[PDB]
Subunit: 194 residues, 4 copies
């Protein structure tokens, strides 16, 4: 008995390394992992500078990936305390999955990142989590499971793994915390499944 | 000295009527009112079953409408406790206005709608309010100003004007609350501007 | 094996009947249930209109009751979008349990009530949930499991079971939704403990 | 015309110094400032290690203080994403002010404190703000008014002034941000009161 973890994310920066690090932790805990991204929604003018080169290997998410999953790791870089327009759009397309209660009972964990110290590390996850209540999905926080969560001065908190700053490079603390989120969501996904 | 009020919304159903009632209530309070909508962002395979005819007279919003406004009435029907992808994507494009503090200090009020009694009437507004914090915009709730806010059994509350049901038409008490929200945003925007 | 379910609540009104109905539903799902209340924190001159004559058979909560439980049903009447001062003060005493990670991993479901239609049926649960993030407790919503959650126009919703009005008597919809929340928390608690 | 600013807070540590700085910034903006704290609600057992002597100069808040004020700076150290039980209990006693619409239309700003880097610096403010919706009070965020709000690596942010760590002493960045919040609430307070 092995859970299917879907690591879903919007973004092209440090959120990509966060998604891969979560999936790494989920694999080491013993789970089938699929890392998927959402379609871009910003008008054409914004899309010219978007670095698709570092995400060309990561496939676009289908609704079949949602059905395939026993557990979810949904993420987005903060956009003023909320998830990005890209991810929100895709979550709006899951209306058929809602009418049929496909995702009901399945666990979900949330991850984000912000440029400044307190610019959407906690609130973004709390606002994202409203989605879980409507779908009947159990929210899985990481809390203070590993010592690194007490010790971190950069990214990551009880609400979920994060990244501090604009650059795409995760430090040691942020990597340990992200992998732990992979573990925690696997453990709960295994409990509900098996 | 009269303030400009922008009523900005996503949607096609009952949300349009709420927008117009917020607009009307703001004109009665003596404000220059523009009702604008956002660019649709859903994949074309999910618009079916999306009527663009109800929004023919309502033109798309521009970024100059944002600096024009002295107050805001940002709205969206609920999409599982959050604003819709359409509104969220537009608010992402306001990153141009962010760094140079264009919207700083300007009032904002929020409104939504939900088909079920407790399925996004409150939380959608609280999750929408985060935007105001990052931009330095002051949040204007309705509270319990008019007696209709205690009396309402269908749509409307202290957080903002709502509509109950999956239908288009909105009832008497729902209409009055929306006007009061338009009044409230006008009163606060005038206070900040004319000071 | 059967899970231990603690139904913890502040209140004296209809939140008591909601607490009992959740406990009733939890034990039908096959759980060991203890219903407890929290100590009052209000200054004495505000305890005037409080009827202690109705919550005399429900014992105060201890910190080892928290240790006893495999799952939780935490509830409070809305106090302006947040929980009541009594429940909040109790949760502040659980600092030692946080430090030692006693409640880590345990499921938790939230419930509330409000006298007015959109006066804290959704937001109160959302603000209560932050507690669970800091403790690493998995949050259990009810969503739209039973068809009663679509059909209800009074109390109860996806965020948790609620009551509309000031009176104590719950209606048929509200009682079924509260019973379902007890069933849900039990199902999740059984999965984490035994499975 | 001069606005009255009430700085209301729970706590005994670095939250107190945050309250004084917001008071100072409001005074420099040109307002009468009353700094008040709330009654303790924690049971005797959990009052073993509390320095009351740090707050003995600051009087307890009364319901008259809420009527007096034209603007509010309400704060509390984070208690698992929410305000402390002491502040929550006092706010529950303001039920008469709610029924009389005393605070309706008045501006309110929020501030908090957390030991860990993302352990309630911004959610505490978002949770506290629900109070303002029910009372019809208008919320005043600080956003990114001063350049220090971009720069800070310790405490402070768009949601409100904060302190990072279990230390009591605030660093330079934090005092600048706290004083700014006091300036920010005063500006809105006199705009609502005086202008019309």
């Amino acid at each position: 008995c092995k859970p299917n973890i879907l690591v879903l994310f919007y973004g092209y920066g440090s959120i990509v390394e966060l998604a891969k690090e979560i999936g790494k932790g989920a694999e080491e805990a013993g789970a089938e992992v699929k890392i998927r991204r959402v379609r871009e929604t910003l008008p054409p003018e914004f899309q010219s500078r978007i670095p698709f080169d570092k995400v060309k290997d990561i496939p676009e998410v289908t609704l079949d990936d949602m059905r395939w999953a026993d557990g979810f790791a949904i993420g987005s870089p903060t956009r003023y305390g909320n998830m990005a327009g890209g991810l929100k759009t895709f979550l709006d397309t899951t209306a058929i999955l809602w009418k049929d209660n496909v995702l009901y009972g399945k666990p979900v964990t949330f991850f984000t990142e912000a440029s400044t110290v307190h610019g959407g590390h906690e609130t973004t996850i709390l606002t994202m989590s409203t989605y879980a209540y409507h779908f009947g999905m159990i929210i899985v926080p990481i809390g203070y499971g590993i010592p690194e969560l007490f010790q971190t001065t950069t990214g990551g908190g009880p609400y979920g793994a994060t990244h501090l700053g604009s650059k795409e490079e995760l430090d040691e603390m942020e990597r340990k915390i992200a992998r732990f989120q992979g573990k925690r969501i696997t453990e709960v996904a295994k409990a509900i499944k098996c």
